[PDB]
Symmetry: C3
Subunit: 147 residues, 3 copies
Amino acid sequence: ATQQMMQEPLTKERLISDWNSNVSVAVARTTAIAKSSDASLVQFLAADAAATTKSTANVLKQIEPLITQPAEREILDKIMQVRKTYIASRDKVSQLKADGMAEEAESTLINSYVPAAQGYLKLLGELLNLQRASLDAKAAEVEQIES
Amino acid sequence: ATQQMMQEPLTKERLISDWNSNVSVAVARTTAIAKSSDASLVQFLAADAAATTKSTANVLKQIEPLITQPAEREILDKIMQVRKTYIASRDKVSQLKADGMAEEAESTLINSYVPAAQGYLKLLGELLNLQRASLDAKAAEVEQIES
Amino acid sequence: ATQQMMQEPLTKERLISDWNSNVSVAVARTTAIAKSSDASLVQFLAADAAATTKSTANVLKQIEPLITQPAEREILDKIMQVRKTYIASRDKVSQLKADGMAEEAESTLINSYVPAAQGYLKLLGELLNLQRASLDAKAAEVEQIES
Protein backbone atom coordinates (compact mmCIF):
# COMPACT_ATOMS: atom_id res chain seq x y z
CA ALA A 1 0.00 0.00 0.00
CA THR A 2 1.03 3.66 -0.29
CA GLN A 3 4.19 3.82 1.82
CA GLN A 4 4.50 7.20 3.54
CA MET A 5 7.64 5.97 5.30
CA MET A 6 9.44 8.25 2.85
CA GLN A 7 8.52 11.51 4.56
CA GLU A 8 11.32 11.94 7.09
CA PRO A 9 14.08 11.61 4.43
CA LEU A 10 12.07 13.74 1.98
CA THR A 11 11.51 16.44 4.60
CA LYS A 12 15.17 16.44 5.63
CA GLU A 13 16.23 16.74 1.99
CA ARG A 14 13.82 19.59 1.25
CA LEU A 15 14.79 21.52 4.37
CA ILE A 16 18.51 21.20 3.63
CA SER A 17 18.01 22.19 -0.01
CA ASP A 18 16.16 25.34 1.08
CA TRP A 19 18.88 26.06 3.67
CA ASN A 20 21.58 25.87 0.99
CA SER A 21 19.63 28.26 -1.26
CA ASN A 22 18.97 30.73 1.55
CA VAL A 23 22.65 30.89 2.46
CA SER A 24 23.46 31.70 -1.14
CA VAL A 25 21.02 34.59 -1.10
CA ALA A 26 22.49 35.76 2.20
CA VAL A 27 25.92 36.02 0.60
CA ALA A 28 24.49 38.53 -1.88
CA ARG A 29 22.48 40.38 0.78
CA THR A 30 25.53 40.78 3.03
CA THR A 31 27.52 42.04 0.05
CA ALA A 32 24.85 44.65 -0.63
CA ILE A 33 24.87 45.66 3.05
CA ALA A 34 28.62 46.22 2.80
CA LYS A 35 28.79 47.93 -0.61
CA SER A 36 25.61 49.95 -1.10
CA SER A 37 25.51 53.77 -0.86
CA ASP A 38 21.69 53.66 -0.14
CA ALA A 39 21.39 53.83 3.66
CA SER A 40 17.66 53.08 4.01
CA LEU A 41 18.09 49.96 1.85
CA VAL A 42 21.07 48.90 3.96
CA GLN A 43 18.99 49.17 7.12
CA PHE A 44 16.14 47.21 5.53
CA LEU A 45 18.51 44.43 4.41
CA ALA A 46 20.11 44.24 7.89
CA ALA A 47 16.68 43.99 9.52
CA ASP A 48 15.86 41.24 7.02
CA ALA A 49 19.00 39.30 7.97
CA ALA A 50 17.98 39.56 11.63
CA ALA A 51 14.65 37.89 10.72
CA THR A 52 16.17 35.17 8.53
CA THR A 53 18.56 34.28 11.37
CA LYS A 54 15.58 33.28 13.54
CA SER A 55 14.02 31.47 10.57
CA THR A 56 17.23 29.44 10.21
CA ALA A 57 17.56 28.77 13.96
CA ASN A 58 14.05 27.38 13.95
CA VAL A 59 14.74 25.21 10.89
CA LEU A 60 17.78 23.95 12.83
CA LYS A 61 15.54 23.06 15.77
CA GLN A 62 13.24 21.28 13.32
CA ILE A 63 15.89 19.21 11.56
CA GLU A 64 18.29 18.20 14.31
CA PRO A 65 16.03 15.47 15.87
CA LEU A 66 16.01 13.79 12.44
CA ILE A 67 19.80 13.71 11.94
CA THR A 68 20.94 10.53 13.70
CA GLN A 69 23.59 8.75 11.61
CA PRO A 70 27.27 9.32 12.40
CA ALA A 71 28.41 10.95 9.15
CA GLU A 72 25.49 13.38 8.95
CA ARG A 73 25.70 14.15 12.67
CA GLU A 74 29.41 14.95 12.23
CA ILE A 75 28.64 17.26 9.27
CA LEU A 76 25.87 18.94 11.28
CA ASP A 77 28.11 19.71 14.25
CA LYS A 78 30.74 21.11 11.87
CA ILE A 79 28.08 23.35 10.33
CA MET A 80 27.04 24.50 13.78
CA GLN A 81 30.57 25.76 14.50
CA VAL A 82 31.09 27.40 11.14
CA ARG A 83 27.68 29.05 11.62
CA LYS A 84 28.90 30.82 14.74
CA THR A 85 31.88 32.13 12.80
CA TYR A 86 29.54 33.13 9.95
CA ILE A 87 26.94 34.95 12.05
CA ALA A 88 29.71 36.83 13.87
CA SER A 89 31.41 38.03 10.67
CA ARG A 90 28.08 38.93 9.01
CA ASP A 91 26.93 40.89 12.07
CA LYS A 92 30.32 42.60 12.14
CA VAL A 93 30.01 43.94 8.58
CA SER A 94 26.45 45.01 9.43
CA GLN A 95 27.46 46.79 12.67
CA LEU A 96 30.45 48.45 10.96
CA LYS A 97 28.31 49.70 8.06
CA ALA A 98 25.56 51.00 10.38
CA ASP A 99 28.21 53.09 12.21
CA GLY A 100 29.65 54.76 9.09
CA MET A 101 32.68 52.46 8.71
CA ALA A 102 32.15 51.26 5.15
CA GLU A 103 35.78 50.58 4.29
CA GLU A 104 36.08 48.15 7.24
CA ALA A 105 32.64 46.75 6.39
CA GLU A 106 34.04 45.69 3.00
CA SER A 107 37.38 44.56 4.38
CA THR A 108 35.49 42.33 6.82
CA LEU A 109 33.20 41.04 4.08
CA ILE A 110 36.09 40.02 1.84
CA ASN A 111 38.60 38.86 4.51
CA SER A 112 36.25 37.16 7.03
CA TYR A 113 32.65 36.83 5.83
CA VAL A 114 33.16 35.30 2.38
CA PRO A 115 35.59 32.57 3.58
CA ALA A 116 33.18 31.61 6.38
CA ALA A 117 30.25 31.61 3.94
CA GLN A 118 32.21 29.38 1.60
CA GLY A 119 32.94 26.89 4.38
CA TYR A 120 29.28 26.99 5.42
CA LEU A 121 28.21 26.33 1.83
CA LYS A 122 30.70 23.49 1.38
CA LEU A 123 29.37 21.76 4.50
CA LEU A 124 25.75 22.30 3.45
CA GLY A 125 26.47 20.83 0.04
CA GLU A 126 28.09 17.80 1.66
CA LEU A 127 25.09 17.31 3.93
CA LEU A 128 22.66 17.54 1.00
CA ASN A 129 24.59 14.99 -1.11
CA LEU A 130 24.76 12.73 1.93
CA GLN A 131 21.02 13.12 2.44
CA ARG A 132 20.24 12.29 -1.18
CA ALA A 133 22.30 9.08 -0.90
CA SER A 134 20.40 8.27 2.31
CA LEU A 135 17.01 9.08 0.77
CA ASP A 136 17.66 6.78 -2.19
CA ALA A 137 18.86 3.94 0.07
CA LYS A 138 15.80 4.33 2.28
CA ALA A 139 13.39 4.43 -0.66
CA ALA A 140 15.02 1.37 -2.25
CA GLU A 141 14.48 -0.72 0.81
CA VAL A 142 11.00 0.63 1.49
CA GLU A 143 10.31 -0.75 -1.98
CA GLN A 144 11.97 -4.01 -0.95
CA ILE A 145 9.77 -4.04 2.18
CA GLU A 146 6.80 -3.62 -0.20
CA SER A 147 8.15 -6.31 -2.59
CA ALA B 1 3.62 8.31 26.39
CA THR B 2 4.81 11.07 24.05
CA GLN B 3 2.33 13.88 24.73
CA GLN B 4 1.67 15.90 21.57
CA MET B 5 -0.89 17.97 23.49
CA MET B 6 1.79 20.66 23.37
CA GLN B 7 1.30 21.57 19.71
CA GLU B 8 -1.42 24.21 19.85
CA PRO B 9 0.50 26.38 22.37
CA LEU B 10 3.78 25.75 20.53
CA THR B 11 2.22 26.67 17.18
CA LYS B 12 0.62 29.81 18.60
CA GLU B 13 3.95 30.86 20.13
CA ARG B 14 5.91 30.25 16.92
CA LEU B 15 3.39 32.09 14.77
CA ILE B 16 3.35 35.11 17.08
CA SER B 17 7.15 35.17 17.30
CA ASP B 18 7.38 35.21 13.49
CA TRP B 19 4.69 37.94 13.35
CA ASN B 20 6.69 40.14 15.73
CA SER B 21 9.84 39.67 13.63
CA ASN B 22 8.05 40.40 10.36
CA VAL B 23 6.62 43.65 11.70
CA SER B 24 10.10 44.74 12.68
CA VAL B 25 11.34 44.13 9.17
CA ALA B 26 8.33 46.01 7.80
CA VAL B 27 9.33 49.07 9.81
CA ALA B 28 12.65 49.13 7.95
CA ARG B 29 11.05 48.38 4.57
CA THR B 30 8.53 51.22 4.96
CA THR B 31 11.36 53.54 5.94
CA ALA B 32 13.23 52.59 2.77
CA ILE B 33 10.08 53.15 0.70
CA ALA B 34 9.84 56.66 2.16
CA LYS B 35 13.52 57.66 2.04
CA SER B 36 15.13 55.97 -0.96
CA SER B 37 16.06 57.85 -4.17
CA ASP B 38 16.00 54.53 -6.17
CA ALA B 39 12.53 54.38 -7.76
CA SER B 40 12.62 50.80 -9.09
CA LEU B 41 13.64 49.55 -5.63
CA VAL B 42 10.84 51.57 -4.06
CA GLN B 43 8.31 49.95 -6.37
CA PHE B 44 9.70 46.49 -5.62
CA LEU B 45 9.53 47.08 -1.86
CA ALA B 46 5.92 48.37 -2.13
CA ALA B 47 4.91 45.32 -4.15
CA ASP B 48 6.58 43.18 -1.48
CA ALA B 49 4.57 44.88 1.28
CA ALA B 50 1.38 44.17 -0.68
CA ALA B 51 2.32 40.45 -0.64
CA THR B 52 3.30 40.33 3.04
CA THR B 53 -0.04 41.94 3.93
CA LYS B 54 -1.86 38.88 2.54
CA SER B 55 0.65 36.59 4.27
CA THR B 56 -0.16 38.30 7.58
CA ALA B 57 -3.94 38.27 6.99
CA ASN B 58 -3.75 34.54 6.41
CA VAL B 59 -1.64 33.99 9.54
CA LEU B 60 -4.35 35.96 11.36
CA LYS B 61 -6.99 33.61 9.98
CA GLN B 62 -4.83 30.70 11.14
CA ILE B 63 -4.25 31.90 14.69
CA GLU B 64 -7.53 33.45 15.72
CA PRO B 65 -9.43 30.12 16.28
CA LEU B 66 -6.70 29.22 18.81
CA ILE B 67 -6.91 32.42 20.88
CA THR B 68 -9.70 31.77 23.39
CA GLN B 69 -8.72 33.11 26.82
CA PRO B 70 -9.93 36.57 27.88
CA ALA B 71 -6.59 38.36 28.24
CA GLU B 72 -5.17 37.11 24.93
CA ARG B 73 -8.48 37.71 23.14
CA GLU B 74 -8.45 41.30 24.45
CA ILE B 75 -4.86 41.81 23.23
CA LEU B 76 -5.77 40.31 19.85
CA ASP B 77 -8.72 42.64 19.30
CA LYS B 78 -6.52 45.61 20.26
CA ILE B 79 -3.95 44.47 17.70
CA MET B 80 -6.67 44.19 15.09
CA GLN B 81 -7.58 47.87 15.54
CA VAL B 82 -4.02 49.14 15.63
CA ARG B 83 -3.40 47.07 12.49
CA LYS B 84 -6.01 49.04 10.58
CA THR B 85 -4.30 52.26 11.64
CA TYR B 86 -0.93 50.75 10.68
CA ILE B 87 -1.92 49.48 7.23
CA ALA B 88 -3.54 52.84 6.44
CA SER B 89 -0.48 54.88 7.40
CA ARG B 90 1.93 52.48 5.62
CA ASP B 91 -0.17 52.53 2.44
CA LYS B 92 -0.31 56.31 2.69
CA VAL B 93 3.49 56.72 2.68
CA SER B 94 3.62 54.22 -0.20
CA GLN B 95 0.94 56.02 -2.25
CA LEU B 96 2.52 59.43 -1.54
CA LYS B 97 5.98 58.21 -2.59
CA ALA B 98 4.66 56.55 -5.77
CA ASP B 99 3.11 59.90 -6.79
CA GLY B 100 6.29 61.98 -6.36
CA MET B 101 5.44 63.38 -2.92
CA ALA B 102 8.53 62.29 -0.99
CA GLU B 103 8.50 65.05 1.62
CA GLU B 104 4.96 64.08 2.70
CA ALA B 105 5.94 60.40 2.45
CA GLU B 106 8.56 61.03 5.15
CA SER B 107 6.35 63.33 7.20
CA THR B 108 3.72 60.57 7.24
CA LEU B 109 6.31 57.93 8.11
CA ILE B 110 7.61 59.86 11.10
CA ASN B 111 4.33 61.44 12.33
CA SER B 112 1.86 58.56 11.70
CA TYR B 113 3.51 55.30 10.63
CA VAL B 114 6.20 54.93 13.29
CA PRO B 115 3.85 55.61 16.25
CA ALA B 116 1.35 53.07 14.89
CA ALA B 117 4.14 50.54 14.30
CA GLN B 118 5.33 51.06 17.86
CA GLY B 119 1.86 50.42 19.26
CA TYR B 120 1.54 47.34 17.05
CA LEU B 121 4.90 46.06 18.29
CA LYS B 122 4.05 46.73 21.94
CA LEU B 123 0.84 44.72 21.61
CA LEU B 124 2.60 41.89 19.78
CA GLY B 125 5.25 41.73 22.48
CA GLU B 126 2.55 41.57 25.15
CA LEU B 127 0.78 38.75 23.30
CA LEU B 128 4.02 36.77 22.94
CA ASN B 129 4.91 37.10 26.66
CA LEU B 130 1.35 36.10 27.52
CA GLN B 131 1.63 33.10 25.20
CA ARG B 132 4.92 31.98 26.74
CA ALA B 133 3.35 32.10 30.23
CA SER B 134 0.42 30.07 28.86
CA LEU B 135 2.68 27.57 27.08
CA ASP B 136 4.67 26.92 30.27
CA ALA B 137 1.50 26.51 32.36
CA LYS B 138 0.06 24.10 29.80
CA ALA B 139 3.26 22.06 29.56
CA ALA B 140 3.57 21.88 33.35
CA GLU B 141 0.17 20.35 33.72
CA VAL B 142 0.53 18.08 30.72
CA GLU B 143 3.49 16.75 32.68
CA GLN B 144 1.27 16.49 35.75
CA ILE B 145 -1.31 14.61 33.64
CA GLU B 146 1.57 12.28 32.67
CA SER B 147 2.78 12.03 36.31
CA ALA C 1 -19.31 15.87 12.41
CA THR C 2 -16.49 18.29 11.57
CA GLN C 3 -15.87 17.62 7.87
CA GLN C 4 -12.19 18.06 7.01
CA MET C 5 -12.94 16.95 3.45
CA MET C 6 -12.48 20.63 2.62
CA GLN C 7 -8.70 20.65 2.92
CA GLU C 8 -7.58 19.68 -0.58
CA PRO C 9 -9.63 22.47 -2.26
CA LEU C 10 -8.64 24.93 0.48
CA THR C 11 -4.96 24.06 0.13
CA LYS C 12 -5.09 24.31 -3.66
CA GLU C 13 -6.78 27.71 -3.41
CA ARG C 14 -4.29 29.06 -0.87
CA LEU C 15 -1.28 27.83 -2.84
CA ILE C 16 -2.55 29.37 -6.08
CA SER C 17 -3.38 32.66 -4.35
CA ASP C 18 0.17 32.85 -2.97
CA TRP C 19 1.57 31.94 -6.42
CA ASN C 20 -0.35 34.81 -8.03
CA SER C 21 0.93 37.26 -5.41
CA ASN C 22 4.53 36.08 -5.74
CA VAL C 23 4.48 36.53 -9.51
CA SER C 24 3.29 40.08 -9.03
CA VAL C 25 6.20 40.81 -6.73
CA ALA C 26 8.55 39.19 -9.23
CA VAL C 27 7.41 41.63 -11.90
CA ALA C 28 8.60 44.50 -9.69
CA ARG C 29 11.83 42.72 -8.71
CA THR C 30 12.74 42.02 -12.34
CA THR C 31 12.03 45.65 -13.18
CA ALA C 32 14.40 46.75 -10.42
CA ILE C 33 17.05 44.32 -11.69
CA ALA C 34 16.76 45.92 -15.13
CA LYS C 35 16.54 49.60 -14.11
CA SER C 36 18.58 50.09 -10.94
CA SER C 37 21.99 51.83 -10.90
CA ASP C 38 22.90 50.06 -7.57
CA ALA C 39 24.94 46.99 -8.59
CA SER C 40 25.10 45.22 -5.20
CA LEU C 41 21.31 45.48 -4.89
CA VAL C 42 20.92 44.12 -8.42
CA GLN C 43 23.04 41.10 -7.55
CA PHE C 44 21.07 40.52 -4.34
CA LEU C 45 17.74 40.70 -6.20
CA ALA C 46 18.99 38.27 -8.89
CA ALA C 47 20.16 35.82 -6.24
CA ASP C 48 16.73 36.17 -4.62
CA ALA C 49 14.99 35.34 -7.92
CA ALA C 50 17.16 32.23 -8.21
CA ALA C 51 15.86 31.11 -4.78
CA THR C 52 12.20 31.92 -5.48
CA THR C 53 12.41 29.89 -8.70
CA LYS C 54 13.12 26.75 -6.65
CA SER C 55 10.39 27.73 -4.18
CA THR C 56 7.92 27.94 -7.08
CA ALA C 57 9.12 24.67 -8.69
CA ASN C 58 8.52 22.92 -5.40
CA VAL C 59 5.06 24.47 -5.01
CA LEU C 60 4.40 23.16 -8.53
CA LYS C 61 5.45 19.68 -7.45
CA GLN C 62 3.12 20.05 -4.46
CA ILE C 63 0.05 21.19 -6.36
CA GLU C 64 0.10 19.17 -9.56
CA PRO C 65 -1.09 15.84 -7.99
CA LEU C 66 -4.20 17.73 -6.81
CA ILE C 67 -5.16 19.21 -10.20
CA THR C 68 -7.23 16.50 -11.89
CA GLN C 69 -10.22 18.06 -13.67
CA PRO C 70 -9.98 18.80 -17.40
CA ALA C 71 -10.36 22.59 -17.34
CA GLU C 72 -7.86 23.14 -14.51
CA ARG C 73 -5.44 20.61 -15.99
CA GLU C 74 -5.61 22.48 -19.31
CA ILE C 75 -4.93 25.81 -17.56
CA LEU C 76 -2.03 24.24 -15.63
CA ASP C 77 -0.32 22.91 -18.75
CA LYS C 78 -0.72 26.33 -20.40
CA ILE C 79 0.90 27.93 -17.36
CA MET C 80 3.74 25.44 -17.55
CA GLN C 81 4.57 26.56 -21.11
CA VAL C 82 4.25 30.26 -20.43
CA ARG C 83 6.48 29.71 -17.39
CA LYS C 84 9.31 28.47 -19.59
CA THR C 85 8.97 31.60 -21.71
CA TYR C 86 8.85 33.71 -18.53
CA ILE C 87 11.88 32.18 -16.81
CA ALA C 88 13.90 32.52 -20.02
CA SER C 89 13.08 36.20 -20.50
CA ARG C 90 13.62 37.02 -16.80
CA ASP C 91 16.99 35.22 -16.76
CA LYS C 92 17.90 37.05 -19.96
CA VAL C 93 17.38 40.52 -18.43
CA SER C 94 19.32 39.32 -15.37
CA GLN C 95 22.24 37.93 -17.42
CA LEU C 96 22.32 41.06 -19.64
CA LYS C 97 22.35 43.39 -16.62
CA ALA C 98 25.06 41.38 -14.83
CA ASP C 99 27.28 41.77 -17.93
CA GLY C 100 26.96 45.57 -18.21
CA MET C 101 24.28 45.59 -20.93
CA ALA C 102 21.62 47.68 -19.21
CA GLU C 103 19.99 49.09 -22.34
CA GLU C 104 19.29 45.56 -23.65
CA ALA C 105 18.27 44.51 -20.13
CA GLU C 106 15.47 47.10 -20.29
CA SER C 107 14.61 46.40 -23.91
CA THR C 108 14.20 42.73 -22.99
CA LEU C 109 12.16 43.59 -19.90
CA ILE C 110 9.70 45.72 -21.86
CA ASN C 111 9.57 43.73 -25.13
CA SER C 112 9.74 40.12 -23.81
CA TYR C 113 9.49 39.85 -20.02
CA VAL C 114 6.42 41.99 -19.32
CA PRO C 115 4.24 40.34 -22.03
CA ALA C 116 5.20 36.88 -20.73
CA ALA C 117 4.52 37.97 -17.14
CA GLN C 118 1.12 39.28 -18.20
CA GLY C 119 0.21 35.99 -19.85
CA TYR C 120 1.43 34.11 -16.78
CA LEU C 121 -0.70 36.34 -14.54
CA LYS C 122 -3.77 35.98 -16.75
CA LEU C 123 -3.51 32.19 -16.57
CA LEU C 124 -2.94 32.23 -12.81
CA GLY C 125 -5.97 34.43 -12.33
CA GLU C 126 -8.07 32.05 -14.43
CA LEU C 127 -6.87 29.08 -12.39
CA LEU C 128 -7.67 30.83 -9.10
CA ASN C 129 -11.22 31.79 -10.21
CA LEU C 130 -11.71 28.24 -11.42
CA GLN C 131 -10.48 26.91 -8.08
CA ARG C 132 -12.82 29.16 -6.11
CA ALA C 133 -15.79 27.90 -8.17
CA SER C 134 -14.61 24.33 -7.49
CA LEU C 135 -14.07 24.98 -3.77
CA ASP C 136 -17.60 26.37 -3.37
CA ALA C 137 -19.14 23.45 -5.30
CA LYS C 138 -17.20 20.97 -3.19
CA ALA C 139 -18.14 22.66 0.09
CA ALA C 140 -21.80 22.85 -0.91
CA GLU C 141 -22.02 19.15 -1.47
CA VAL C 142 -19.94 18.27 1.57
CA GLU C 143 -22.68 20.14 3.41
CA GLN C 144 -25.27 18.12 1.47
CA ILE C 145 -23.40 14.93 2.46
CA GLU C 146 -23.68 16.18 6.06
CA SER C 147 -27.38 17.12 5.60
